[PDB]
Every structure is written in C-alpha cells, then in structure tokens.
Curated annotation (Swiss-Prot), chain A:
Forms a complex with an importin alpha subunit. Interacts with XPO1. Forms a heterodimer with IPO7. The KPNB1/IPO7 heterodimer interacts with H1 histone. Interacts with SNUPN. Interacts with H2A, H2B, H3 and H4 histones. Component of an import snRNP complex composed of KPNB1, SNUPN, SMN1 and ZNF259. Component of a nuclear export receptor complex composed of KPNB1, Ran, SNUPN and XPO1. Interacts with SRY. Interacts with PRKCI/atypical protein kinase C iota. Interacts with KPNA2. Interacts with KPNA7. Interacts with SNAI1 (via zinc fingers) and SNAI2 (via zinc fingers). Residues 286-462 are annotated as: Essential for high affinity interaction with RPL23A. HEAT repeats lie at residues 2-31, 33-65, 85-123, 129-160, 170-202, 212-247, 253-302, 314-360, 364-394, 402-438, 449-485, 500-537, 544-592, 600-639, 644-681, 686-724, 732-776, 786-829, 831-873. Gene3D superfamilies: Leucine-rich Repeat Variant. Residues 329-342 are annotated as: IAB-binding. The modification Phosphoserine is found at residue 12. Residues 334-419 are annotated as: Ran-GTP binding. The modification N6-acetyllysine is found at residues 211, 835, 867. The lineage of its organism: Eukaryota, Metazoa, Chordata, Craniata, Vertebrata. Mono-ADP-ribosylated by PARP16. This is Importin subunit beta-1. PANTHER family: IMPORTIN BETA (PTHR10527).
UniProtKB/Swiss-Prot annotation, chain B:
Expressed ubiquitously. Functions in nuclear protein import as an adapter protein for nuclear receptor KPNB1. Binds specifically and directly to substrates containing either a simple or bipartite NLS motif. Docking of the importin/substrate complex to the nuclear pore complex (NPC) is mediated by KPNB1 through binding to nucleoporin FxFG repeats and the complex is subsequently translocated through the pore by an energy requiring, Ran-dependent mechanism. This is Importin subunit alpha-1. Belongs to the importin alpha family. It comes from Homo sapiens (Human). A motif (Nuclear localization signal) lies at residues 35-44. Residues 1-44 form the IBB domain. Heterodimer; with KPNB1. Interacts with ANP32E. Component of a complex containing CSE1L, RAN and KPNA2. Interacts directly with CSE1L. Interacts with PLAG1. Interacts with APEX1 (via N-terminus). Interacts with FRG1 (via N-terminus). Interacts with ARL4A, CTNNBL1 and NBN. Interacts with SNAI1 (via zinc fingers) and SNAI2 (via zinc fingers). Interacts with BAG6. Interacts with AIFM2; this interaction likely mediates the translocation of AIFM2 into the nucleus upon oxidative stress. Interacts with RSL1D1. Consists of an N-terminal hydrophilic region, a hydrophobic central region composed of 10 repeats, and a short hydrophilic C-terminus. The N-terminal hydrophilic region contains the importin beta binding domain (IBB domain), which is sufficient for binding importin beta and essential for nuclear protein import. Residues 1-17 are annotated as: Disordered.
Length: 876, 44
C-alpha cells in the first residue's frame, strides 16, 4: 500500500484496521529505520498532504526518538545517533523546514525537533538548530504559526534536555523567548508559547540572571506579561514569577518593593481562579524559601558562622496585607465539595498555615479578629472560614501563647461539632484534630475531654467528609493521651490513661465505621483503619482486653478477604479489594507488635497461611505484596527463631519478591524481609543464603532496577555476614568488589536529589563493611582468623571514609557509621590501622566533628572511636 | 503549584501511609541494629 494511505488508517476507530496499519509501520521501521524516518519526514514536511497523515507521520517520528521510559529513551537516542549522518541530515531539514507550515494547532514538527535535539545537542551534532529557531522567532516578517511552532519547539527542548547541556546556549535561547514575550507582539498565542518556553528554561539561565543588564530585561518582560489581557499569558507569567522567586530569591530585593508585591497581591484578589491560585502560590513559596533560610541561619549559627544566604523576611512584611486577603478567600468554599480539586479556598488555607509556621506569633494578632467576628456568623461560609483560620494558625506560634486562646475556644468548638452545615462540621473536626496534635493539654482536660469524646464518637456516624476527619482527630487524640500517661510510670507502657474508660466504645465504633457501605468516599475506610491502628498501638495496659478481642476480629476479616474474589466485577472492584488487603495487613503489622509473645504464637500459623495465599493468587498490585511482606517481617520479628517452621514453604515467595525488581517497593520489602530473617534465624539461615545472595547479586547487576534498591541490598549484605559469620567467606570476594565499586560512586554536588542519595549509598557501604568486619571476627577473643581476609582492603575503606570527610555534604548518619567503622577497625587489626589513620588527616576532623554534633549517636561513636585509636597509640 | 496534599487530611492517602509505614520500619531496624552493635563494642 501507500505510506500516506496507511498513516491515515491509524485514525480509524476500528481495532483491526489500527492494528494492521500500526504493524505495517513497526515493520518498516525494523527493516530500514533510516529510510523509514526519511519517508515520514517527507510526508510531515509536505503541506499538500492531509492534516491526518502529517500528524500521524510526526507521531511515528517522535515515537522513534523518545519514550516515557528513560531506559527506552536512551536506547532510541543512541539508535538514532548510529544512523548515517547523511540520513539524519535529511530528516533534520525536513523537520525544521516544517516549522510554520502546519495549520494543525499543536505542532507535530515541534515534538520531532525536540526528540532529535535531545539526542544531537548533547554532542553538538546539529549546530544549525538554535540559530534557526532564533531566526524564526526574531525575523520581523515571520508568520504567527512560524513563531508559535518554533517557540513550542524551544519549550519542548528545555523541558526534555538536561539543563546542564543547554547552559551554553541559554544566551540565544533567551533572546528568542524574550522576543516572543514582548508587549508589542500581535499574537497572544505567540506570547503564550514564549512565556511557557521561559518557564521551562529558567533552570539553565543562572549565568544570565547574574548580569543585571539581562536580569532587568527578563524581569520587565515578565512583569509586563502579567499585565496582558489574555488570561492565559497572565497565568503563565505569574508562574514564571513563582519559579524565579524560588531560583533567584537573592536577587529579588530589587524588584519586590517596586513591583512583585503589587502584581502578586493584585492576583490574589482576582475573581479568576487560575489567577488567584498563582498569586497565592507565589507567597506560599516565599514562606517555604524563608523557612528554609531560617533553618540555614539556625544551622550556621551553631557552626559559629554566617549563613551562605540570608532571608529578607518578605512574608513577615507582607503579613498585614496577605491575611485580610487570605481569610476572605476562605469564604469562597464550594458547597458541593470535590476533595480532589485545588481551588483558591483550599490554597488560602494552606498559605495561612505556611505563614503561621513562617512568621510564628506575628500572625495571631492579624488572624484572631477575623476569627472572633465570624465564629458566630449565621453565614456558614464565614463561620467555616473562621474555624479553618483558627485551625490554620495552631502550628508556629509559641504554645504558651496559644494554649489560653485554645482553652477559651473549646466551648464554641464543641458547639461547632454539631453545627447544621456539613462544611462547618468537616472543618471543626479537622480543627479538633489539630488541637489534639499540637496543643493537647487543651483537649486532655478534666473539663473538655468528656464532651469532646462524645462529639467525636457521634461524628464517626456522620457524612464521609466529616467522619474521615473525625477518624484522624481520634488517632491524634490517642497519641497525645498515650504520651500524657506514661510521662513517668517507672516502666514500659502506662498502667492506664484517660481513654481507658471508653477504649472499647471507640474501637467498636471504628470497626463499624470500617464497614460503612460509603467507606470509599473521602478515603473514609482507610482513615477508619489507620485510626484504629493508632488507637491500638497507643493504648494503656488495662486496654489489652479489648485489644485481644480486636485482634480476633482482625483475623476473621482477614479470611473474609481470601474468599472475596467473587464480588470483584468492575475494575474499581479489584482496586478497592486490594486496598482492604493492605489495610488488614497493615493493621496486622500493628497488633503483632502489641500482643504478648505468647498470644502471637497461636495467631502465627493461621496468619502465615493467610499471608501465604494472599501472595500467590494476587500477583497483581504490588502495594498488597508490599504490605503482605511487611506483615511477614512483623511476624518474623515476633516469632523469632521459631519462624523457621515456615521458611521451607515461604522460600518461593521470598524469591519472587526479590526477582520483581520492576516494583522497587515490593523488592525493598523483600530485601527488608531478608534482613529480618537474618536477625531471627541467625546461622539457621545458612541453607537459604545461596539463593538470596544469587538473587541479590543479580538485582545489582541489572542497572534497570530502581536505584533505591542498591543501598538496601548493600546494607543487608552486612546483616547476612553477621548472621552466618564464617560461612560468608563464600561471597566475600564478590561483595567487597561490589562494595568497592559502590563506595567510589559520586554524583553532582549540586543536585540535592543525589546529594542526599549518595549519603544513603555511603551509609549502606559503611554499614556493610561494619557488618562484614564484625561477622568474620567471631564473637569474643582477639581478632579471629577470618577478618584477616579483609586486612588488605583496610586501606581503601579508610580512603573511602577519608574522602567522605572531605565533601562537606555528609550527614550525621554517615559520620556516625564511619566513626563506628574506624572503631571496629582498631579492634580488628590493631596497631596497624593507626599509622593509616594519622596519614589521612580528614579522618581526624571527622571524628572531631562527631564529638561535637548534636546527634548523640554521632557523638557516642565519634567519642568511642577516638578512645579506641588512642588505645592503639598507647599500646605497642 | 498544587499543595493539595497539605490541605487538611487529603495528603494522608494510602500511598503516603504505606511510605510512612516503611519509614517506621527502616528506623526500627536501625534501633535494633544500632543497639546490637553498641552491645558488642561496649559503649554508652
């Protein structure tokens, strides 16, 4: 057939016709990709072809260059780079020449340019791209479509390529973008595109923002764009202001007073939701930036030095004007509430909580008057806003300042629990929950505890919207009650606590709430179960009766599930069924850690089977598997060596969990389970080690696996060594090499997503060495024979730790584990290790740092390691 | 630009609760391991 004719068939609302066409395309690509790519571009580049065929042609190209799977994307990029440079050129010309020739709105060529550029640019393989787009945008004779398309393309490029590689082209790119954003531009569409392209490009414009000439130019075009009549440009320009505020807070003092304040404040007052949200976001963001800076200042203070950056306290200064604006917006609720919708009302509430944690006590005098004037207002919108505002300012101000205001407010709050408006009852429940969480003394009172409990117990029967918050209120009330009781009981758990008198009533009600037919609304069922878990955990000893009765109830429902593959009709049925599965396991995880080691033995067998079958049949949904495995860990923890009885039948499931690797959390649970099995079974886990070790090594040698699994595996290696000791010599060589390779790892000292990941892969290595060292050293007398096997690796371990002392990244977690290693090394090799440590200076300062640190464990271990090294000197 | 997860109890869904559950476990493993090593070495 004719390629164009096939492309048009890809839009047929006929399953077979689509399949026929799709398969034709897939095999043309397989046979000769370079030629296929060429012929499609020719189609896309021709205006004479139908809209349909062109768009289809662009789709086939994009899908040949990019993907959602980073692994598949990389594969397609190199596959494309491998193509004859003469072939690629043709496609690049056709694709670039298409810009402006499309009548179709969302440009199909745009995506292709980006798809190709993402591969070429990082290797200067397409030097004609940028100059062309710039030319397209700047040219005073360029059409509207020409401009829009190109801007779209620039936007895709900035959104898809690593900012690290456009950093040198930021110059020309900004020129094209800003030109498109200028006020004098006829088309609002061009403006929209340029402004969205700007948002995507800020990450790599640091160098430009550093030049006041260019900075001012950018800030003016953007502020000017927030004044554009087309609401779409308004909103996008506002978004740019939010991101700029994050990235370049330090340069903002020049523009805050003179313009940003007015612009953002005016936006919050807009009646256009889209706009109001952007203005509210701007300030919530300022609050976040300033709270971080407050942490930086507080931290620098303890290190006896000035912070690298300093806040300008914009929120504190805008406080007077934001609060009246924010509280009035709380008045804009949507009676018909959709709890998945983000509107100005919800945003104002959150902004208020942020300002409160940011400006602490300063906010109270600005918010109380609105709360006082409206707490008794007949209009529910205002009554509700007043309780919300009250609940929003409970965190941040000094408790000593709030307690009294909260005590004097209880009577009205209790009354509000019975307000006729559902909206109002919903908020009042949340507010009670927040008092129980932040200012508990006001709730655990001999005056209000009783009427509060009756209100909360009745609330569990109310509409989902209300009962949900009531569940959470109860969970936090239970915590505060537990704490106030065991403050000083001279032993483990408290004898009693104020919730004892009605502990059974509460648990009975939560269980009822758990089976409400409308439990799917407002995550009611989940909350009811999560609340029950917290109530059981945080219970007094004299509540153990109801806890036993409750545990029997949990097991019963546990089986009702296994035999519930019947009702599962619609797809949503398989999902909500899964949820229940998790809740029950999670609720199990909780009871098991609360039951007498004797009680848990009668339940063990019956449950192990329940967790056994729940895994086999239910292969779909890893969330269940994750809680099922976590439940198993919980059981293993209780039973102990006794668990051995099942290991034989659970082996396959343990493996599966480790093989998965596609659902990192199911695998992280498996690995986590392996480790518990070690602390439980001990040497008795020797027979199952070959399997696990084989599986663990495979997981590591499979770069496709989520990076968050590697450190967990490395960590568990140290535990397995401790569990089997000498029998580990069997894997030593492999593991140390693995540990050796991981320890040399290193990312960019800028990407904090990695800077915190490296300190996770580092701690795991230190914890792996520590385990290995301890495992081979036996248990008592002088350094045992085995550890000598590691003696030759001693040098790097110290080097690794030495380099760690260098990078001022660290983490009191890494410092502590390293300190513990230095120590164990002194106890494993002796005098030797001393000559190697005084060689690497950075280790001395690290131990010094540990001695300081407000992390007791970081101190203890750094103090201990120092003592050990000191003993080697004064030894021989 | 959406902080729904910060609105009342909206952010306390199943994914978030599972994440916290795992957090409690990971930290619980440390306490067991840290206290077991501290009794091998002989320290505070």
């Amino acid at each position: 057939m004719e390629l164009i004719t096939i492309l048009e068939k890809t839009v047929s609302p006929d399953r077979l016709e689509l399949e026929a066409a799709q398969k034709f395309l897939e095999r043309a690509a397989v046979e000769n990709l370079p030629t296929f790519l060429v012929e499609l571009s020719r189609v896309l580049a021709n205006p004479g072809n139908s809209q349909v065929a062109r768009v289809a042609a662009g789709l086939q190209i994009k899908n040949s260059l990019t993907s959602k799977d980073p692994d598949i994307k990389a594969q397609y990029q190199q596959r494309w780079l491998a193509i004859d440079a003469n072939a690629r050129r043709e496609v690049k010309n056709y694709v670039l020449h298409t810009l402006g020739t499309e009548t179709y709105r969302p440009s199909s060529a745009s995506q292709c340019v980006a798809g190709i550029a993402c591969a070429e640019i990082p290797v200067n393989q397409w030097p004609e791209l940028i100059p062309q787009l710039v030319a397209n945008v700047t040219n005073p004779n360029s059409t509207e479509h020409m401009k829009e398309s190109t801007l779209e393309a620039i936007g895709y490029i900035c959104q898809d390529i690593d900012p690290e590689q456009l950093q040198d082209k930021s110059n020309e790119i900004l020129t094209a973008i800003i030109q498109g954003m200028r006020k004098e531009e006829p088309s609002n569409n061009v403006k929209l595109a340029a402004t969205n392209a700007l948002l995507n490009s800020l990450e790599f414009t640091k160098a430009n923002f550093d030049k006041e000439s260019e900075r001012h130019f950018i800030m003016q075009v953007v502020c000017e764009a927030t004044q554009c009549p087309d609401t779409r440009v308004r909103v996008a320009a506002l978004q740019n202001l939010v991101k700029i505020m994050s990235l370049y807070y330090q340069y903002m003092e020049t523009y805050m007073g003179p313009a940003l304040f007015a612009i953002t404040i005016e936006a919050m007052k807009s009646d256009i939701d889209e706009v109001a949200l952007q203005g509210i976001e701007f300030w919530s963001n300022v609050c976040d930036e300033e709270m971080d800076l407050a942490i930086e200042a507080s931290e620098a203070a303890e290190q006896g030095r000035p912070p690298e950056h300093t806040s300008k306290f914009y929120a504190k200064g805008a406080l007077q004007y934001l609060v009246p604006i924010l509280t009035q917006t709380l008045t804009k609720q949507d009676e018909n509430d959709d709890d998945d919708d983000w509107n100005p009302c919800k945003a104002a509430g959150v902004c208020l909580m942020l300002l409160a944690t940011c400006c602490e006590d300063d906010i109270v005098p600005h918010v109380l008057p609105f709360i006082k004037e409206h707490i008794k207002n007949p209009d529910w919108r205002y009554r509700d806003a007043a309780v919300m505002a009250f609940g929003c300012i409970l965190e941040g101000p000094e408790p000593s300042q709030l307690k009294p205001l909260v005590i004097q407010a209880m009577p009205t709050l209790i009354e509000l629990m019975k307000d006729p408006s559902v909206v109002v009852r919903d908020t009042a429940a949340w507010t009670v929950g927040r008092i129980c969480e932040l200012l508990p003394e006001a709730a655990i009172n001999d005056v209000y505890l009783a009427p509060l409990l009756q209100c909360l117990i009745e609330g569990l029967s109310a509409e989902p919207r209300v009962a949900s918050n009531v569940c959470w209120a109860f969970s936090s009330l239970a915590e505060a009650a537990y704490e106030a009781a065991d403050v000083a009981d001279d032993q483990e758990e408290p004898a009693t606590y104020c919730l004892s008198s009605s502990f059974e009533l509460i648990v009975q009600k939560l269980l009822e709430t758990t089976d409400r037919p409308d439990g799917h609304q407002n995550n009611l069922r989940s909350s009811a179960y999560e609340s029950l878990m917290e109530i059981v955990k945080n219970s007094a000893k004299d509540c153990y009766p109801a806890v036993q009765k409750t545990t029997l109830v949990i097991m019963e429902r546990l089986q009702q599930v296994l035999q519930m593959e019947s009702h599962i009709q619609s797809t949503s049925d398989r999902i909500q069924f899964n949820d229940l599965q998790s809740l029950l396991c999670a609720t199990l995880q909780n009871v098991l850690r609360k039951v007498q080691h004797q009680d848990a033995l009668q339940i063990s067998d019956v449950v192990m089977a329940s967790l056994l079958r729940m895994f086999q049949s239910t292969a779909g949904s890893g969330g269940v598997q994750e809680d099922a495995l976590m439940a198993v860990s919980t059981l293993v923890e209780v039973l102990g060596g006794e668990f051995l009885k099942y290991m034989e039948a659970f082996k396959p499931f343990l493996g599966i969990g480790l093989k998965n690797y596609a659902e990192y959390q199911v695998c992280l649970a498996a690995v986590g389970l392996v480790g518990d099995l070690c602390r439980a079974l001990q040497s008795n886990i020797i027979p199952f080690c070959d399997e696990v070790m084989q599986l663990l090594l495979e997981n590591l040698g499979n770069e496709n696996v989520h990076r968050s699994v590697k450190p967990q595996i490395l960590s568990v290696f140290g535990d397995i060594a401790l569990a089997i000791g000498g029998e580990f010599k069997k894997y030593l060589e492999v593991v140390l090499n693995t540990l050796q390779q991981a320890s040399q790892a290193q990312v960019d000292k800028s990407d904090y997503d990695m800077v915190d990941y490296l300190n996770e892969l580092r701690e795991s290595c230190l914890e792996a060495y520590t385990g290995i060292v301890q495992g081979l050293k036996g248990d008592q007398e002088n350094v045992h024979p085995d550890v000598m096997l590691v003696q030759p690796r001693v040098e790097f371990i110290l080097s690794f730790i030495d380099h760690i002392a260098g990078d001022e990244d660290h983490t009191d977690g890494v410092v502590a584990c390293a300190a513990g290693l230095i120590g164990d090394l002194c106890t494993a090799f002796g005098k030797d290790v001393l000559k190697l440590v005084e060689a690497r200076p950075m280790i001395h300062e690290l131990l010094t740092e540990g001695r300081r640190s407000k992390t007791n464990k970081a101190k203890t271990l750094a103090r201990w390691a120092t003592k050990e090294l000191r003993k080697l000197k004064n030894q021989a | 630009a959406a902080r729904l997860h910060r609105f009342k109890n909206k952010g306390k869904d199943s994914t978030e609760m599972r994440r916290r559950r795992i957090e409690v476990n990971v930290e619980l493993r440390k306490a067991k391991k840290d206290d077991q090593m501290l009794k091998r070495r002989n320290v505070s």
